[PDB]
């Protein structure tokens, strides 16, 4: 009946959204760290190839390794630029909009939770409308519903209750009087009229919306109405705008999954940076035909397919460095070394070696 | 008087906090982007120095440039590690805690704003308790209060209302009945008793807290009480925990200002990476005396002070690249070039040239 407390069908879908929004900062941290980790893996591959080229100076294999190093360095460079320009804004916006909306929801749910007169009459009722619910641990009547922002640790992004189309559980309600409102439980937050609701000497001046515009509480003796949020479209200035903002920001996330962060499997000539470097440094021409590139790639890779690139990378990974450059009993093959700072100083050592050998030879 | 609507002295300090929390995501975007930009500047300097070394093999300054390149590459590497491991969590946590708390505050203030019966009687009153307040642009009764999360552009947040000590304006209240509550304005949100407050058939079974535990609304006919939040200490499980969490997260922020992101001004031998590289690549000993390092630095830098480092950096910045590597009539000095991906391919060109020299020399 109108003006009575809210059964679980009303508030459980709000708990589900609240708990999923709690994971948005975790997914932002996961994605920002994944982006940096992938950039670091590209940089490590660039550094291994660079070190190989210093050790093997003056060989066609070394020239192949310079092409490999340039490829991976360009990927690492472009990934950092994407992290700066695109991912940082995406993830800050998703974190802020989700956390703000979660705060709006949680303040409303926490109000319902506390606004009760007894174990059988209050604003937040169980599935059947028999008992008011209580919060114990992170659950309310068995429903996960912490009403708090959890400590932030990285967690892989997922989407169940808030997805591409909207908030799956926040559908049109055709019979709020019977499905949302109890028959008996008293709750002044269910109307703006003075007899059973928020008004004192008279009704409130207008309808009141709660939970960032989700629920509309009339100033007359009538049931609440709710926004259907399961089929959203971009809008501005809506009464329920924070719901749209969080949905749009989550839908916008690409993660660390754009081309900058992913390795390529489309042959050698089309690999990032390769044709341009061949044109600029080997042919020393501004334009090239495909056959000219293939001829150069045959000289340094013995082919132009993925398999020939992989074969050069295997040579790079198998190349040992001087034992003095790693710890006692530690691996010395480039593919068994990782970490940007570690490989950077190994490259510096071999650049110093190259400078000295150049002096001796000239 | 107890159980009456709230004058501006009560809610204006909450608006001040809500407005300042709105800036925290802007500061997160600012810092995440600043960290990436500073890493990119370090990488550009490493690349310029690397290119100078490739061009000038045969001179002592070329070996100085290897040392310069190693320094900046290590700075770029360590900055990316700091962005991944430390800054990303700091900025996500500050964004989430501030936005969540802002959502809790804004939902409460928006409830007060709407819960009114007339232009002179409601839950949200002006300073004197004469008129109810209305939303007007981005204010409530003229007080900046948007009750929205603003679009996020990078900006450094203010620390006027949330600072190192806590929430400066949320002090102990000595007389809520006279300073927070009006004499006449009706407001069922001001108490849990049934005559004038939230109870229907009787008083609510317990006190109700609102605004993430800031205000306590008693179930008897008495004024509200508030938490003093101006002198916070670290705690867990508090009834007002979201306030503590946002305060702790904001105070923890370093910005992109730790050593990884800042250039050094303490001479050459103490500059990141330099002594170890001299020991490992030039002296080829595991432990060195300070005078042995100075002797090597004299060979390559003509000294060991900042001025000699600056002089080598000037040689690097003045070095022209081949005109075909840049546009027609475009600048050619390394110091007039910027952009990681751009400098990366220039280094590849000069590495290819070096490969061609060694191919003959060997």
């Amino acid at each position, epitope marked *: 009946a109108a003006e009575k407390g809210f059964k679980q069908a009303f508030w459980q879908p709000l708990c589900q959204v609240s708990e999923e929004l709690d994971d948005q900062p975790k997914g932002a941290l996961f994605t920002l760290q994944a982006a940096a980790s992938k950039i670091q893996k590209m940089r490590d591959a660039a550094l291994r190839a660079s070190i190989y080229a210093e050790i093997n100076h003056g060989t066609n294999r070394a020239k192949a390794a310079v092409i490999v190093a340039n490829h991976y360095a360009m990927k690492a460079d472009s990934g950092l630029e994407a992290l700066k320009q695109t991912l940082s804004s995406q993830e800050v916006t998703a974190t802020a909009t989700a956390s703000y909306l979660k705060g709006r929801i949680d303040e409303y749910l926490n109000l319902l939770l506390q606004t009760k007169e007894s174990g059988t009459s209050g604003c937040m009722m169980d599935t059947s409308g028999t008992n008011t619910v209580t919060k114990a641990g992170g659950t309310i009547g068995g429903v996960p519903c912490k009403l708090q922002l959890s400590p932030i640790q990285p967690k892989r992004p997922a989407a169940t209750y808030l997805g591409k189309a909207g908030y799956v559980g926040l559908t049109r309600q055709a019979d709020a009087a019977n499905n949302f409102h109890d028959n008996d439980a008293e709750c002044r937050l269910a109307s703006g009229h003075n007899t059973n609701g928020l008004g004192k000497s008279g009704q409130l001046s207008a309808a009141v919306t709660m939970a960032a515009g989700y629920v509309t509480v009339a100033n007359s003796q009538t049931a609440v109405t709710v926004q259907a949020l399961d089929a959203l479209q971009e809008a501005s200035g809506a009464a329920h705008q924070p719901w749209i903002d969080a949905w749009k920001a989550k839908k916008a996330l690409t993660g660390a999954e754009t081309a900058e962060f992913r390795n390529e499997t*489309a042959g050698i000539a*089309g690999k990032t940076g390769v*044709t341009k470097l061949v044109e600029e440094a080997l042919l020393k021409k501004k334009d090239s035909e495909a056959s000219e590139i293939q001829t150069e790639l045959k000289k340094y890779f013995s082919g132009h397919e993925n398999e020939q690139w992989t074969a050069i990378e295997k040579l790079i990974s198998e190349q040992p460095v001087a034992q003095n450059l790693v710890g006692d009993n530690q691996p010395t093959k480039l593919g068994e070394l990782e970490g940007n700072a570690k490989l950077t100083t190994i490259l510096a050592y071999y650049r110093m070696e190259t400078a000295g050998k150049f002096e001796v030879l000239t | 008087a107890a159980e009456k609507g709230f004058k501006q002295a009560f809610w204006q300090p909450l608006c001040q906090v809500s407005e300042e929390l709105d800036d925290q995501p802007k500061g997160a975007l600012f810092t995440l982007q600043a960290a990436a930009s500073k890493i990119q500047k370090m990488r550009d300097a490493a690349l310029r120095a690397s290119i100078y070394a490739e061009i000038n093999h045969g001179t002592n300054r070329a070996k100085a440039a290897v040392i310069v390149a190693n320094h900046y590459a290590m700075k770029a590497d360590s900055g990316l590690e700091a962005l991944k491991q430390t800054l990303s969590s700091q900025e996500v946590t500050a964004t989430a805690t501030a936005s969540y708390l802002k959502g809790r505050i804004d939902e409460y203030l928006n409830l007060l704003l709407q819960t009114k019966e007339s232009g002179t009687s409601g839950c949200m009153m002006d300073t004197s308790g004469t008129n109810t307040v209305t939303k007007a642009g981005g204010t409530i009764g003229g007080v900046p209060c948007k009750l929205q999360l603003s679009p996020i552009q990078p900006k450094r947040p203010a620390a006027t209302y949330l600072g190192k000590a806590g929430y400066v304006g949320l002090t102990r209240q000595a007389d809520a009945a006279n300073n927070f509550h009006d004499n006449d304005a009706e407001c069922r949100l001001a108490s849990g008793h049934n005559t004038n407050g939230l109870g229907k058939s009787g008083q609510l079974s317990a006190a109700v807290t609102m605004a993430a535990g800031y205000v306590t609304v008693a179930n008897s006919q008495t004024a509200v009480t508030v938490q003093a939040l101006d002198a916070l200490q670290e705690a867990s499980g508090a009834a007002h925990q979201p306030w503590i969490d946002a305060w702790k997260a904001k105070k923890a922020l370093t910005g992109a200002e730790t050593a990884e992101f800042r250039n050094e001004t303490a001479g050459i031998a103490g500059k990141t990476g330099v002594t170890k590289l001299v020991e490992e690549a030039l002296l080829k000993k595991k432990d060195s005396e300070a005078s042995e390092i100075q002797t090597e630095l004299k060979k390559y830098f003509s000294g060991h002070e900042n001025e000699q480092w600056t002089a080598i950096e000037k040689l690097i910045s003045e070095q022209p690249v081949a005109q075909n590597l840049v546009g027609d009539n475009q600048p050619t000095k390394l110091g007039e070039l910027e952009g990681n991906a751009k400098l990366t391919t220039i280094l590849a060109y000069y590495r290819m040239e070096t490969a061609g020299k060694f191919e003959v020399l060997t």
Partner: nanobody
Amino acid sequence: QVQLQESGGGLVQAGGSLRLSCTTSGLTFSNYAFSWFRQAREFVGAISWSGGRTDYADSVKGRFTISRDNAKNTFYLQMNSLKEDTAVYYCAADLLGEGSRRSEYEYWGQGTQVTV
């Protein structure tokens, strides 16, 4: 996911002009070279990631022009002397590309119909 969205197509009288736009979402626009293709598939034109090099197919050279607006994440084709030009026009993105019809394109739009 990343989206390239073409717009501006339609029915146009021969001999006139038409501007097509390609707007990206979810992508660092300034990291990518962009090209137009068409299928009545053939290359139309390309711009380098830096914007410093453009290349046009022989069939459109002197009639069509291309430009990029990094601030608006938008890539343009200005069509003039429309004639043989009827086709679906597609935009495509090439990471750090030089503006070449031979490159590997990582992203493609859905196309916009031009009927002359």
